[PDB]
Amino acid sequence: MRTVSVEAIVEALVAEGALRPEEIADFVERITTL
Amino acid sequence: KKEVRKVRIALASPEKIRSWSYGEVEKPETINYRTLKPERDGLFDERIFGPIKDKSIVRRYRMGHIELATPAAHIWFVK
Amino acid sequence: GREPTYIAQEPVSLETPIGDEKDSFYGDFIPDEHLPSPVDAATQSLLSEELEKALSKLSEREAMVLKLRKGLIDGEEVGAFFGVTRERIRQIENKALRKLKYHE
Amino acid sequence: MVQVDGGRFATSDLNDLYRRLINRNNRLKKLLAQGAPEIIIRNEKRMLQEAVDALLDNGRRGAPVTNPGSDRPLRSLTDILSGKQGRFRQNLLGKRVDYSGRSVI
Amino acid sequence: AEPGIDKLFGMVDSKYRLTVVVAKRAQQLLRHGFKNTVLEPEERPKMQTLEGLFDDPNAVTWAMKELLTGRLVFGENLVPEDRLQKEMERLYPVE
Amino acid sequence: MEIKRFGRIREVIPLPPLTEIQVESYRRALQADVPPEKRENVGIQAAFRETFPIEEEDKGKGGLVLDFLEYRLGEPPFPQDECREKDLTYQAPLYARLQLIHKDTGLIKEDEVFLGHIPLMTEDGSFIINGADRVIVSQIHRSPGVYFTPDPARPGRYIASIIPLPKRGPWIDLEVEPNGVVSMKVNKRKFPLVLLLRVLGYDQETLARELGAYGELVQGLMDESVFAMRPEEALIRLFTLLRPGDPPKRDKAVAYVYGLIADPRRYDLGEAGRYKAEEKLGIRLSGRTLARFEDGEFKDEVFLPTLRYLFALTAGVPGHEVDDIDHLGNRRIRTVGELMTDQFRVGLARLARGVRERMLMGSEDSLTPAKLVNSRPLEAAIREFFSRSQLSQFKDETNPLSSLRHKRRISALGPGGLTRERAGFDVRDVHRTHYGRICPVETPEGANIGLITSLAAYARVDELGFIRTPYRRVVGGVVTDEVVYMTATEEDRYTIAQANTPLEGNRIAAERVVARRKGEPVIVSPEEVEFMDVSPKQVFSVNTNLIPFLEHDDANRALMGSNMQTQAVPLIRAQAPVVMTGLEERVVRDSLAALYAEEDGEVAKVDGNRIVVRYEDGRLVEYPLRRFYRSNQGTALDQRPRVVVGQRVRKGDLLADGPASENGFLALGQNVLVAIMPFDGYNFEDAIVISEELLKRDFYTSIHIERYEIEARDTKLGPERITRDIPHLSEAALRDLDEEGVVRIGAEVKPGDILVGRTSFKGESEPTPEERLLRSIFGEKARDVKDTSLRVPPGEGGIVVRTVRLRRGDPGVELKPGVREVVRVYVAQKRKLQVGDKLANRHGNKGVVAKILPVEDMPHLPDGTPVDVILNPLGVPSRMNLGQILETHLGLAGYFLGQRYISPIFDGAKEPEIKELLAQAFEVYFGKRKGEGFGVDKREVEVLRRAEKLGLVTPGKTPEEQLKELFLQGKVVLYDGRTGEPIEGPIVVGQMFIMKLYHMVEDKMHARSTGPYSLITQQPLGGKAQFGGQRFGEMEVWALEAYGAAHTLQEMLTLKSDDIEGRNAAYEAIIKGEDVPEPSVPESFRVLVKELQALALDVQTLDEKDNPVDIFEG
Structure with missing residues (x-):
């Protein structure tokens, strides 16, 4: 199959200038679980 | 070696649709959690599509086909 | 009211508008770890064959009790026993591995 | 299909739409072999057309959802060839670029 | 600007044809070695930190020198494409 | 540094505590410090009483009477820094007193149920939410009242509008259609209003005589006298107009709601909605709607005067009442307390929706607690607001001024859907009512013009959401020391005179007076004058009121000065402006940046960590310092102790400076010695040139x-x-x-x-x-x-x-x-400052440092003093902002006088005052050089030669008298530092206040060779030790298409990031030393085939003659 790691993808999202580390943080936090 | 001056879109006969494909997707089996590896004849088969192992390009270019038991309509031509 | 102490989760789709409900799809921010995925096939090929080697060089009543308990379906040792005491299975289990680990 | 935080996956919606159709088609097969009471075979064929219309183009008949949490249409083969990024538009629209930079001037 | 561009624009019916000539000359002037050149006896492009452009800094600039003299020929269907490549490799080594 | 201040307008009353819009509102919303016995209820306690009579009567078994006694908060869980280390909210637990009655004996009262945590406000006016500080903006919307609109479609008559909000109210319209039917539009229904008046008890014989006598139009009312001969039979008649299939016999049913209980209410009995129709029509309004509960038949307090004032307007002059939308007496500001209470009540009725369904599944008597109460609906409703509302946002705390401006913003884009990004034209314009109430400057550039705008300095919000500016009364011609904050509509009733009006103690002086009636500029006499302004400061915001010679600055580049002071970054060697406005000690007070003695006393201990003082009353207090705290956007906010052990202090005296505070003054930048002249193309368009002495002295660090x-x-x-x-x-x-x-x-x-x-x-x-x-x-x-x-x-x-x-x-x-x-x-x-960083003055002069000259080769004075900053004069004439020129001149005199100046905003320094300070200066700049033994320089006379040829000195005088003439004009002989040859004309230099903006070059520069690539899209991204690419957009594709850059463009789209085989071949071939080959085939082309091929579309590729071409490389 195929692997991946979210910590590096999140830092890339934070660098990309989409939203602030607040919104991306809420995103990763909903990503974690419910 | 030869140049590509023209592109044409047509309707594809199911006899064609079977030609482009390499084998049929048999089972609704993606991959199991125990081994991250393609299940019995599933959507991510290697015989059908190509090796996930090293490139990943032959795999994004080889198609499979599903064999319908009763025909169904291409909703584009309906709606 | 508490959420206490002491292989199951639900997939999130690949395309979901992140951020301020914008145009991004979530696959767009995933870079990769590696392509070839080595030590898989060349390892299990050694891994499996060098197992059966020592696995058969001691008594089959010894080695197979755990080959298939820890390896075939489940686990346990409250019922590991095909019919001996819960104490001799732990006895022969451990003693099996030990002569299996290193032979004097 | 990928394996994300050690034990978590991410899925293209097409894959669940393709599984749904393999489901419906296989049950139709087994329902013909095991006797074909018509109104049952007809329900299954209805389900089969509905799942072909699903992976080809959602939102044309009410959209199929993933679970009772992300009630948001699965991305069909039609969605990928139009819309915000799609396939046609995104190439015209412009991509990121390796050998590039910013600074103040 | 760049040395004698006005003279190069005049050489060609099409502004853009100059570009392709320069580019395609630069490509061969790299591919089949660098000895493909027509001008390498005396005063041909140079650099600093030594004087060292007589082997291989900027191939495209070279092509613009070379084309700035009547030594090179350019045109629509000069020679069959395939014996063009066979005869170039065959005549010059460096591979 | 001595401070001389300029102009005297005895600004009679100080600035209001500038944070009160947040502090005092949230105090009103939470009557927490006062017992529940206390009478006033608005906000939180009213949000209970609104929903809290909870009546499920009889649908099979009833008797639910759960009602309100008390509520209390008391104790926050963790301290505030605690709440910031651990990602915690700074809350208090809300838990109220409850008793539920039965249809039978008894009433089981449980005391407390902690139905949710409620966050709290710090003393500076901010919230902590997820561990991050956070600020609640205010809002504007049409105040809920009775309005009269000129008929948009039909030119000539008017339409009424009764508008309730919260949206839980029904909008209604009273367009008097053609032919005379008094139509009435509710929820897109429409019908003769008379149908409703007769539900109210109004018989048709009184409707005409005592209401519609003066207008003959009342004959448009009584047309359907056939339906309005029957009172309660017209209620069932009106029930017909709604059609889900209702039971026509239910009598008070739909008219219960637009009668009393929940639909058009305003916060509380009193002035909550009553002022907004009492002033516009009728006399009073009543309870907070059109109600009867005690008799069953309905009274209206509204519909009669509403249509009665649609007569009084459609005919003749009572006054000429019409209503303007954008008037600030007819638009309303929504503070933080209201906003939370609005959301608190919606979160309280989500609980009421639950206690109903738990009345059915309930057992008989075992109910008292959590069988009715869970935090989920309220807890989630408050948490949604502070954490993801559109009007909550990170504390803009770049510096003290930055956060103070932020807590005092006013937005139009409400989360309820008030105004959206599409509409602009009249919404954004400044209206006459913004005078004294909303700054005409503070709005930001770009998309959010006019939408987000800060409130005036003296402006404040009264008990209802109206902005209210002060004025002071003048008795005939005698001005009083008594001030009245006035509503925007109430303002229009009077003659208000302008603050620059001459005085003699209490009298007007000039018979020819400047004064405003409602909006118009009016010239008037001393007798007519009814009020007068308090100060010219009450016209603009707090930031706009820190620009010293704003009077000389174009409004356009004035907002650029105002908005940039926000972006001022705290400097380690921070400095107060050489020429201030006066508010710069009041800004570091009201923002709690600094630390001031609580009483008179003495200092006992001073660490860099903490200060300890001994007051008169006997207290010995320990004030711990904020040592090196990070801000929300990276700047360093620390405190510095400015007192010594054994030093006496007075109450209010300063103990420690805030982050951008110089000894009690707002220190946003530094006072540099600027020479305003071109240079060798180095201060081009708006670039800046810097003396390396700054970095040595470490000022711009x-x-x-x-x-x-x-x-x-x-x-x-x-x-x-x-x-x-x-x-x-x-x-x-x-x-x-x-x-x-x-x-x-x-x-x-x-x-x-x-x-x-x-x-x-x-x-x-x-x-x-x-x-x-x-x-x-x-x-x-x-x-x-x-x-x-x-x-x-x-x-x-x-x-x-x-x-x-x-x-x-x-x-x-x-x-x-x-x-x-x-x-x-x-x-x-x-x-430190570095080439590329951004600098600006208070007057709106953007600029990036473009060159750092060594001190040796840059303009200097006769004495070997070099200038520090070189500004290009070509930035002055387009941008009409001469205020920076005066700051320079006045700063030039203050540099040899060793003093700083306060020029109040519009009571500023006049030219003669500046001149005579410069004359005072030159006897020091040059009076001394005579004595030290040095006359005029052969270069100084060569410039005075051309000077008089240019008409800047009057010829025939001595060089000294000419240089003084030339000094007074701000200019001096300046010698190029790299040739020692004089500049051939005189040049103005001086001290200017310049500051370092948040746009440095560390966040800014990026360079990407190769690196990570995304998965579904293969274009690249940053990561381990690699940046991302820059986006090559569609317009950048039109660029290369407009050249012949066919290969360059395909690279941008193929080898750069998208085509895997292509870029791999592209970089491997670069390490080779080869040329990069284009395709092959492109990735986009093969994918679009197979991706079309996923649908049953046969897409072939063809040759020149129609022939099959396999595009998949064998």
Whole structure:
């Protein structure tokens, strides 16, 4: 199959200038679980 | 070696649709959690599509086909 | 009211508008770890064959009790026993591995 | 299909739409072999057309959802060839670029 | 600007044809070695930190020198494409 | 530094506490410090009483009477810094008193139920939410009243409008259609209003005589006298107009709601909605709607005067009443308390929706607690607001002024859907009513013009959401020391005179007076004058009121000065302006940046950590300093003690400076010696040239602290571990990590070093069948573990200054599910000025440093003093902002006089005053050089030669008298530092206040060769030690198309990031030394085939003659 790691993808999202580390943080936090 | 001056879109006969494909997707089996590896004849088969192992390009270019038991309509031509 | 102490989760789709409900799809921010995925096939090929080697060089009543308990379906040792005491299975289990680990 | 935080996956919606159709088609097969009471075979064929219309183009008949949490249409083969990024538009629209930079001037 | 561009624009019916000539000359002037050149006896492009452009800094600039003299020929269907490549490799080594 | 202040207008009353719009509103909303006995109820306690009579009567078994007694908060869980270290909200627990009655004996009262936490406001006016400080903006909307609109479609008559809000009210319209039917539009229904008046008891014989006598139009009312001969029979008649299939016999049913209980109410009995129809029509309004409960038949307090005032307007003059929308007496400001209460009540009726369904499934008497009460609906409704509302947003706390401006914003784009991004034209314009109430300057550039605008300095919000500016009364012609804050509509009733009006103690002086009636500029006499302004400061915002010679600045570049002071970054060597306005000690007061003595007394201890003082009353207080706290956007906000042990102090005296405070004054930048002249193309368009003396003196240096964070999450693979032995690391790469793996404090970290070491088990799972045996075979825990540490990203870090471990055995921390510990490291940088950074004055002069000259080769005075900054005069004439020129002249005199100046905003320094200070200056700039033994320079006379030829000195005088003439004009002889030859004409120099903006060049520069690539889209992105690419957009494709850059464009789209085979061949061939080949085939082309091919479309590719071409490379 195929692997991946979210910590590096999140830092890339934070660098990309989409939203602030607040919104991306809420995103990763909903990503974690419910 | 030869140049590509023209592109044409047509309707594809199911006899064609079977030609482009390499084998049929048999089972609704993606991959199991125990081994991250393609299940019995599933959507991510290697015989059908190509090796996930090293490139990943032959795999994004080889198609499979599903064999319908009763025909169904291409909703584009309906709606 | 508490959420206490002491292989199951639900997939999130690949395309979901992140951020301020914008145009991004979530696959767009995933870079990769590696392509070839080595030590898989060349390892299990050694891994499996060098197992059966020592696995058969001691008594089959010894080695197979755990080959298939820890390896075939489940686990346990409250019922590991095909019919001996819960104490001799732990006895022969451990003693099996030990002569299996290193032979004097 | 990928394996994300050690034990978590991410899925293209097409894959669940393709599984749904393999489901419906296989049950139709087994329902013909095991006797074909018509109104049952007809329900299954209805389900089969509905799942072909699903992976080809959602939102044309009410959209199929993933679970009772992300009630948001699965991305069909039609969605990928139009819309915000799609396939046609995104190439015209412009991509990121390796050998590039910013600074103040 | 760049040395004698006005003279190069005049050489060609099409502004853009100059570009392709320069580019395609630069490509061969790299591919089949660098000895493909027509001008390498005396005063041909140079650099600093030594004087060292007589082997291989900027191939495209070279092509613009070379084309700035009547030594090179350019045109629509000069020679069959395939014996063009066979005869170039065959005549010059460096591979 | 002595301070001389200019102009005297006796500004009779000080500025209101500038944070009150947040503090005092949220105080009103939470009557927390006062007992529940206290009478006033508006806000939180009213939000209870509105919903709280909870009546489920009889649908099978009833008797639910759960009603309100008390509520209390008392105790916040954790201190505030605590709430910031641990990502906690700064809350209080809300738990109210309850008693539920039965249809039978008894009433089971349970005291407390902590139905939700409610966040609290700090004393500076901000909220802590997820551990981050956060600010609630205000809002504007049409105040809920009775309005009369000119008929948009039909030219000639008017339409009424009764508008309730919260939207829980029904909008209604009274368009008098053609033909005379008094139509009435509710919820797109429409019908003769008479149908409703007769539901109210109004018989048709009284409707005409006593209401519609003066207008003959009342004959449009009584037309359907056939339906309005029957009172309660017209109620069932009106019930017909709604059609879901209702039972026509239910009598008060629909008219219960637009009668009393829940639909058009305004907050409370009194003035909540009553003022907005009492003033516009009728006389009074009543209870907060059109109600009867006690008799069953309905009274209206509204419809009669509403239509009666649609007569009084459609005919003749009572006044000429019409209503303007954008008037600030007919638009309303929504503070923080209201906003939370609005959302608190919607969160309270989500609970009421639950207590109903728990009345059905209830058992008989066992109900009292949580069988009716859970926090879920209220807790989630308050949490949604503060955390993801559109009007909550990170505290803009770049500097003290930055956060103060932010708490005092006013937005039009309400989360309820008030105004959207599409409409602009009349919404954004400044209206006459903004005078004294809303700044005409503060709005930002770009899309949000006019939408987000800050409120005036003296403006404040009264008991209802109206902005109310002060004026002071003048008795005939005698001005009083008595001030009246006036509504926007109430303003229009009077003659208001302008603040620059001459006085003699209390009298007007000039018979010819400037004064405003409602909006118009009116010239008037002393007798007619009814009010007068308090100060010219009440016209603009707090920032706009820090620009010293605004009077000389174009409004357009004035908002650029105002908005930039927000972006001022705190400088270590910070400095107050050489020429101030006066508010610069009042800004560092009201923003709690600094620390002032509480009473008279003496100082006992002064650390850099804490100050200790001994007051008169006997107290000995310890004030601990904020040592090096990071801000929300990176700037360093620390306090510095400015007193000594044994020093007496007075009440209000300063003990410690805030982050951007110089000895009690707002210090946003520094006072540089500027020469305004071109230079060798180095100060082109708006560029700036800098003397290296600044970096030596370390003036333009500012500390900045970043924050890096990792989790030791817990995984399928096995738990991750914050440890030092990482596997494949050189010993040199670990030299700075402590034994636990954390970088040690005080070590310089370069991009790529380790901050905290983390090791995680090898992915793809625990393989039970085979490995589980190996775990017992081979020394258990001898598995494999990889490197997943934390490293300084591309960009940079500094030296490590602080760490934070939040470990398991969690001692007061809310670690997320699967989070084992978290570790933080703070890194800091002394960031000096560097070429590329951004600078600006108060007058709106944007500029990036373009060149740092050595001191040797740049303009200097006769004495060897060089200038510090070189501004290009070509930035002055287009941008009409001569105020910076006066700051320079006045700053030139203050530099040789050793003093600073306060020029009040419109009571400023006049030219003669400036001149005579310069004359005072030159006897020091040059009076001394005579005595030291040096006359005029042969170069000074060569310039005075051309000077009089240019008409700047009058010829025939002595060089000295000419140089003084030339000095008074701000200009001096300046010699180019690199030739020693004089500048051939005189040049004006002086002290200008210039500051360093948040746009430095560390956030800014990026350079990408190669690196990561995304998965579904293969275009690239940044990561381990690589940046992302820049986006090559569609317009940039039109660019290359407009050249012949066919290959360049295809590269941008193929080899750069998108085509895998192509870019691999492209870089491998670069390392070769080859040329990059284009395709091959392109990735986009093969994908679009197969991706079309996924649908049953046969897409072939064809040759020149129609022939098949296989595009998949065998």
